[PDB]
Amino acid sequence: GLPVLNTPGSNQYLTSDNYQSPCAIPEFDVTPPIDIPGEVKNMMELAEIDTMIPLNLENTKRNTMDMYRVTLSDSADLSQPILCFSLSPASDPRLSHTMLGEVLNYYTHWAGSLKFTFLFCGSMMATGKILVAYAPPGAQPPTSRKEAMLGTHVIWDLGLQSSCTMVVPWISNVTYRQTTQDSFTEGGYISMFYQTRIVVPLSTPKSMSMLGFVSACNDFSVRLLRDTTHISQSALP
Amino acid sequence: GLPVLNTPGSNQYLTSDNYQSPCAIPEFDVTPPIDIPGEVKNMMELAEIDTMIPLNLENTKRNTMDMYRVTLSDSADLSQPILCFSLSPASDPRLSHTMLGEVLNYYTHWAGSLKFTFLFCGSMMATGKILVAYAPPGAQPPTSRKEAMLGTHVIWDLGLQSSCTMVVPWISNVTYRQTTQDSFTEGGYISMFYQTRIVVPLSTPKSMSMLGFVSACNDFSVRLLRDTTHISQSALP
Amino acid sequence: NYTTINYYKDSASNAALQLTIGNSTITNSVVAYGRWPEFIRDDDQPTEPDVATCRFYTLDTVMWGKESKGWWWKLPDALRDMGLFGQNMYYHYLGRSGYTVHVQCNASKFHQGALGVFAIPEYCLAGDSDKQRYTSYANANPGEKGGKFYSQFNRDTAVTSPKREFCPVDYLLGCGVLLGNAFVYPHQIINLRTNNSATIVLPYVNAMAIDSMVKHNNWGIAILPLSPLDFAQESSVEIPITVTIAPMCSEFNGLRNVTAPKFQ
Amino acid sequence: NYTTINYYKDSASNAALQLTIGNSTITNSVVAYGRWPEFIRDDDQPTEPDVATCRFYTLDTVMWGKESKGWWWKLPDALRDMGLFGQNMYYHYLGRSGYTVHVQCNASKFHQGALGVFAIPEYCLAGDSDKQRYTSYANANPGEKGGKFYSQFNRDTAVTSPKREFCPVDYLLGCGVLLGNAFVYPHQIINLRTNNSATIVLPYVNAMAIDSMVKHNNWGIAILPLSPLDFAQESSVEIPITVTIAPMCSEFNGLRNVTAPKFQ
Amino acid sequence: NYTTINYYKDSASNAALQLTIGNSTITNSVVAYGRWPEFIRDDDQPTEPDVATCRFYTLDTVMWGKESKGWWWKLPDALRDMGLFGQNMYYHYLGRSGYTVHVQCNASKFHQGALGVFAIPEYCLAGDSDKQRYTSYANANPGEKGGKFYSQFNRDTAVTSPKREFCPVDYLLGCGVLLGNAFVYPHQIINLRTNNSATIVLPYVNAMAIDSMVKHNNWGIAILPLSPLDFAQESSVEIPITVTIAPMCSEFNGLRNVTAPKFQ
Amino acid sequence: QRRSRSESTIESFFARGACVAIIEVDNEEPTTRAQKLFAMWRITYKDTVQLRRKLEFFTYSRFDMELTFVVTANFTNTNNGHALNQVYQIMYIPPGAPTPKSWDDYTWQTSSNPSIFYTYGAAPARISVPYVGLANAYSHFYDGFAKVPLKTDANDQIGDSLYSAMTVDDFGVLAIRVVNDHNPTKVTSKVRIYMKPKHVRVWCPRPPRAVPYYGPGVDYKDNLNPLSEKGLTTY
Amino acid sequence: QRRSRSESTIESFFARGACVAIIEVDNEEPTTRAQKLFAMWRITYKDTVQLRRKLEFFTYSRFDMELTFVVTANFTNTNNGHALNQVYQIMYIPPGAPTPKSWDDYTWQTSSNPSIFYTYGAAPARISVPYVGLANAYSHFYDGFAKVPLKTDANDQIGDSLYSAMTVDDFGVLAIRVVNDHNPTKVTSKVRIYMKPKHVRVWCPRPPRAVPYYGPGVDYKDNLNPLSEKGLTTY
Numbered sequence A, B: 001g002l003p004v005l006n007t008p009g010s011n012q013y014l015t016s017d018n019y020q021s022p023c024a025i026p027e028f029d030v031t032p033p034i035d036i037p038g039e040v041k042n043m044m045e046l047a048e049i050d051t052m053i054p055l056n057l058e059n060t061k062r063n064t065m066d067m068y069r070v071t072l073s074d075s076a077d078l079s080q081p082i083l084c085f086s087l088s089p090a091s092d093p094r095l096s097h098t099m100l101g102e103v104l105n106y107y108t109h110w111a112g113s114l115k116f117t118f119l120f121c122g123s124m125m126a127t128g129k130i131l132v133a134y135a136p137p138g139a140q141p142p143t144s145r146k147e148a149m150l151g152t153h154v155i156w157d158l159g160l161q162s163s164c165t166m167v168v169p170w171i172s173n174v175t176y177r178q179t180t181q182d183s184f185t186e187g188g189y190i191s192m193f194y195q196t197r198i199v200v201p202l203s204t205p206k207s208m209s210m211l212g213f214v215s216a217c218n219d220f221s222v223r224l225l226r227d228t229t230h231i232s233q234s235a236l237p
Numbered sequence C, D, E: 001n002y003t004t005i006n007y008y009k010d011s012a013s014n015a016a017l018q019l020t021i022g023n024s025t026i027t028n029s030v031v032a033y034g035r036w037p038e039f040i041r042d043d044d045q046p047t048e049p050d051v052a053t054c055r056f057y058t059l060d061t062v063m064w065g066k067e068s069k070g071w072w073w074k075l076p077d078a079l080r081d082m083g084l085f086g087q088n089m090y091y092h093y094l095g096r097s098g099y100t101v102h103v104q105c106n107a108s109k110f111h112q113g114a115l116g117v118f119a120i121p122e123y124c125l126a127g128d129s130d131k132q133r134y135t136s137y138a139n140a141n142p143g144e145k146g147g148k149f150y151s152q153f154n155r156d157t158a159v160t161s162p163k164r165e166f167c168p169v170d171y172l173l174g175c176g177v178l179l180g181n182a183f184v185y186p187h188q189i190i191n192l193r194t195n196n197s198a199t200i201v202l203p204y205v206n207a208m209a210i211d212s213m214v215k216h217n218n219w220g221i222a223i224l225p226l227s228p229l230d231f232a233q234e235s236s237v238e239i240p241i242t243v244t245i246a247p248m249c250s251e252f253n254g255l256r257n258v259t260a261p262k263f264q
Numbered sequence F, G: 001q002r003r004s005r006s007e008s009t010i011e012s013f014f015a016r017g018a019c020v021a022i023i024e025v026d027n028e029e030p031t032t033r034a035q036k037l038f039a040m041w042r043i044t045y046k047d048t049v050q051l052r053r054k055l056e057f058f059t060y061s062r063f064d065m066e067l068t069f070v071v072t073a074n075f076t077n078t079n080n081g082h083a084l085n086q087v088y089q090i091m092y093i094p095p096g097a098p099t100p101k102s103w104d105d106y107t108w109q110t111s112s113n114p115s116i117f118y119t120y121g122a123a124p125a126r127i128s129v130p131y132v133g134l135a136n137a138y139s140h141f142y143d144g145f146a147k148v149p150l151k152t153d154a155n156d157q158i159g160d161s162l163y164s165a166m167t168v169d170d171f172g173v174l175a176i177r178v179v180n181d182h183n184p185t186k187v188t189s190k191v192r193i194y195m196k197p198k199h200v201r202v203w204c205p206r207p208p209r210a211v212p213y214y215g216p217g218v219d220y221k222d223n224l225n226p227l228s229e230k231g232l233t234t235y
């Protein structure tokens, strides 16, 4: 018949190949689909949904509801930070297990801006001001408000608004960052400080709780699918 | 299905083949390129760049800076040559390790003209004249100025010009020459002599140094890629 | 471009304010997946009580304190004994409906706390024993009263008379997933310093256009305290929480004798 | 012609005088790769000191004698303590800039000697110990003073307190390549019998449009005596060599607190 | 017709009277391969003596008797010492030329005999020892005198001082082929009963447009008696044979000092 | 240009083969005691955890399937002889069809049931399957029962059923045997099944599993402390 | 015609396969002591010297890759029996993905990681890879560090890093195992990996290496006298 020559790679099975194969059930009448609410077209759509951050991962509070709450008080040390973490969406323990982190753990490269939200859950009679700062990498992590205010920052008034939003933009030397810990692709630092103190009147609670959320923006992308480390198996059923 | 007949050569791996193979990472978003200075399109472009020649490969001067310098003096024997070598760009020890030679050692056949440059690094008060000669192969290598001046030659005045250039044209019986030593494809000889002597006034150094450079021209070509002998290995990491 | 021709005949082989409903009135809302409830499309005559079943029914009030860990309900299970809606449920083999859920909780300016309300499709909960999928029908359909969450997993170590009950865990959402991601589902937050009520509109969601309302629950409602309740410097604080649910665009089919499940 | 059709959807699968800058003035030049420095193209607001940073800074003078083997500097390391350029470097996370380098060396008509000046992108030097890539940050960033070449490899045989310093070799260019081929890089030759100065213009070269200026050096400058210095029949001769560098088209981004590296 | 498409990009992969010249005059001719000598085509300035080298040179006369077995010469070797042609040969690295060969032999009507003249390109002869390709340059370039054939192979059984000489055999043509087929080459027959002279015109033949004239001989001339010489009833008969050769369209290139080979 | 989301699509997210079954089959002399001359595997994606976790990101799905089979054989003893190349038979048994009781019963005639004959040493076997769901989409989660107990029922076992289960038998089973007779030396073999979804559509995104799976359901038993320790004010 | 420079192009200069890795994998009975049942190789082109020297002619590069795998197996003893044809699994593990700790752990499910199954005796395996650089081009030379020590650092080890290195883990690793169980006789195998660049662009030409390589960096230890002796006035 037609002369042919077999090239390298014949009779191999690549799990990522895309070929045609015969159908074992010909002439099957498939059930037609219907319009079901909640259709998803892209995994990034899931990363754009805000989810709570387990900020407080202390020994006695981790793996518990209280790990989602950050304490605020009117007698706190105004010279010390409230919370601090690093901009590692997939490797930082406080961000790895979020929906964004779960999606990123299936990929190797990521890029884009991020959106952080903070919700204040005190009484209507409480007032105060907060400073939320982001610092690009390269220098010492901020330890005081004076160092933090030199980077990107936002001032939040609790009384007027119970929620605040801060957008961390994409600023990097490489076009894509790795989803694993690596100094060559570090992202920066996030810190919080008291601008003023929390003031409450009499017959009012002096301690309150704050919640945090994170999400991605429309300019976010991922690359090089890979398996995750959040699920394992030791025996087959 | 479609009848087919397998021909000889099936299921073999030729390292120089050019076929299509499946991609293991489909739908990858490649990072776009940018305009970086210094792009190279052809290896010959590297062979057209002049580089110094280690002319002096004596026992006590080889593998040292002084191997790039040729001594000149006002009391030298005017009847003896200053330097002499053969037109073997890839096999001659004085030309093999140059950029031109390094590129040629990756190929089997070469053709084209060559450009030699000589730089004089004496004082402004020194004067003299030199004769630089090329002799095609076939006869005895020149040993005196009388024999050398019968071939191609150039007269160089140190005082007026501190640098000289000589073009060795392509003159051969075969269309291509081998990059290895072979009498059937020998190229010729290059020699230098004193036309006049070097004259200096009082309170001036009587000894000076000269440097040499070689490069290829726009009519240069190579053929039949092959591995080089300038790199080896004895153990795997 | 690259050339491609499909050889096989099969596609698979191819390479790849006041809201008033009926006779009820309650004085921003959230629509799940941006889809309003609707009747079945053009693509046995169904029965449709336009107003005898599409109205607000109020459940039993619950109490929120400093140790409450959460509450959960299942729909349409919670409305099985509400007027003619339950009668239509138990007199027909197939049913369909959407819902409007309204959560009410009022306090003062000196209170503080936050509630999270989540609407979950196909809300499957975990058991309380080594045996798998051993929960009973009666325990899985509490009805109006509903159930509660727990802060830890209490295994039922009794082989003589197993309870066969759910054991939800608050921080695992009762299904083995972290609570922080529950916001993926349709949700509302009631913060006492800003608002006092929540509203959600749920369309009909299922793999089939219509299905039995007795052996399958389409929706689950979960309420959890994200921040603990507090009031001035008082040791004990309790406030009421109320839930009101309205069926919307309800259809029934398959009329026969009445069904009487054995609830204990 | 031969027929070819690409089957796979992926491309990879397919078969294959006076110069004045700012407030500085110096009285032919060489442009590296024939590319003049330029700002980032159209494809966080950058900061750009037009004249507070784009001007000539003069380094410390060095002495050339009969035993000198060469000198080397790293950019932008050498300018880390020059006016506001260093402040912008240490107050920002990302930086970019090109350079203009001017080498000055004057003598008389009775002197003789030749200097080779080479500008090298990504100039990586070798260590002085069996351990690989063990050189320290402080030793790899000398600054204004720079470093020197050697005529032989002196191994640091001290495991108690390793020095962790470079050991460049003149005829190997400090990186394992023959010096004669260094002319592949942008270069200038200062021959005392013809000229007394050299000038090179370096654009920004890197795999990224912008990168940190603290942990990465984009350029290296190497000066080596191709011919030994001599003067009449004198035993000892020494003459000065001076280097002046001007930043050009410099941009910075990522403003935060200041960075303070520990240089010894 | 059958269909065929070439896949690979490479072609190899694809499936498969008086004649006066210069200041000389001699009073039908044969042109080898029907190609007249010509200069190099359009596709270092060559030197071309138009008349100082393109003229007839006469070699030494030989004697033909009843026991002569043949003679052979090599060109351009035979003309190495002829006027300015040899000087141009030894003063240049590359040379090219064609030839006109004229063989003269006169007798009477009462004589009888036949000579065969053959012009052979790349005429390689066999040795006289067990060692292969061991013939020396001096013995392989006799010059004007030329060499002679033999009727048998005489091995040189002397390892102390090997002669390193050719041992041609008449009926093997000196190269291992039968003489009867030598007429494949350009040839002439001199039969004493019809004519007394032969003429051949040889163009330049080689794998290269131009080549060295010192280390390579382009042509060989062989003269053999096809029929023995006889005259009346005489025991001994001897007659002279003369050879005259004229270079034509000669070019030289690569001028340098003179070459002086060591001929013994 | 600007960055694209080509590889984050559902089709790209599920465009890989994943193992779901490892099945052992032996060829040896039949004997009275139990043997593995033929194996029967119940079709499901819950045997493993990777593809299961990827699929459970959503509540409803609709897709076609591509199945690939890789067979590896080996000896057990070294003092019984050698064997010739073997042929493996893989038959699909839908619900209600008769099931084999021996390696050479009539059920292997496969008059209507599809079957694959594979020769050892050749390329791994491959086939494709369309969407065969009774409803309009597959249901990864089902909050309900298949029976409802009634007050008039004689006993409590009439209406008892497992929670979160639709059908006792779903998608049928696969029966694998070695067609060749038994050589004097025993030969063991393993068949690995790899599954790739194609033409995928999904609905109702769901948070992923955070604790180890325990059975086909959503039950959890051990390792309920996934998160680690970290400082509140520690970068 | 006139001579052309077709074969001196960059594409022609890099249009050949070059070995970069030889990996040993054994099939035998598992035991307590160390074994080579599965191998893990870190991806890099610096293991060998030919392709490395060819690439180091330039400072920056940008290309796609073609990988080919050649497998050769042999016996070790002659008094244990024989073996059947084996199947090899090659899995690519990017940074951050879990790594195997045994030849039969869950990580081999390769639900998302690409994998190749190769049958011994067939044609050598082959795949292609696109440009996967984080930046706009690959950097063969990097003059800098990944960390900068600071005066406020508690100790000197906080900011210590290797010179001329970007990332601790780059491009991931390859894990190779034998899927088949162990025959009574041990079988050894070697996998040779050949790499061919395609669609090549380069920038900033650089002089070639003149002395033997010593480690991933530019360090040199021995044989610093490459040039030989010759006469100044000798042809």
Ligand SMILES: Cc1cc(CCCOc2c(C)cc(-c3noc(C(F)(F)F)n3)cc2C)on1
Pocket: A024, A025, F043, F044, F045, F065, F067, F090, F091, F092, F114, F115, F116, F127, F129, F132, F138, F171
């Ligand atoms: C959701 C979801 C989807 C599935 C699997 C559905 C497909 O089930 C099969 C399988 C796995 C194989 C065959 C099959 N058809 O033919 C063959 C054989 F030829 F290989 F035997 N196997 C048929 C069906 C319906 O399971 N859960």
Ligand SMILES: Cc1cc(CCCOc2c(C)cc(-c3noc(C(F)(F)F)n3)cc2C)on1
Pocket: B024, B025, G043, G044, G045, G065, G067, G090, G091, G092, G114, G115, G116, G127, G129, G132, G138, G171
């Ligand atoms: C410069 C430079 C470029 C490189 C290598 C980049 C490519 O790295 C790989 C390799 C070698 C293989 C795979 C790979 N993909 O799939 C497979 C498998 F299927 F064979 F497992 N291997 C993926 C990447 C990114 O290293 N240095």
Ligand SMILES: N[C@@H](CCC(=O)N[C@@H](CS)C(=O)NCC(=O)O)C(=O)O
Pocket: B233, B234, B235, B236, G019, G022, G192
């Ligand atoms: N002979 C040594 C060295 C073997 C080896 O790996 N050699 C390397 C170079 S040092 C190599 O590339 N060999 C050629 C090949 O086997 O592909 C051994 O067998 O261990």
Ligand SMILES: N[C@@H](CCC(=O)N[C@@H](CS)C(=O)NCC(=O)O)C(=O)O
Pocket: A233, A234, A235, A236, F019, F022, F192, G103, G104, G105, G106, G107, G108, G109
């Ligand atoms: N080592 C155990 C477990 C083997 C096994 O089946 N492991 C499962 C995960 S627990 C697996 O998927 N292994 C990879 C494979 O063999 O494909 C055994 O050999 O019995």
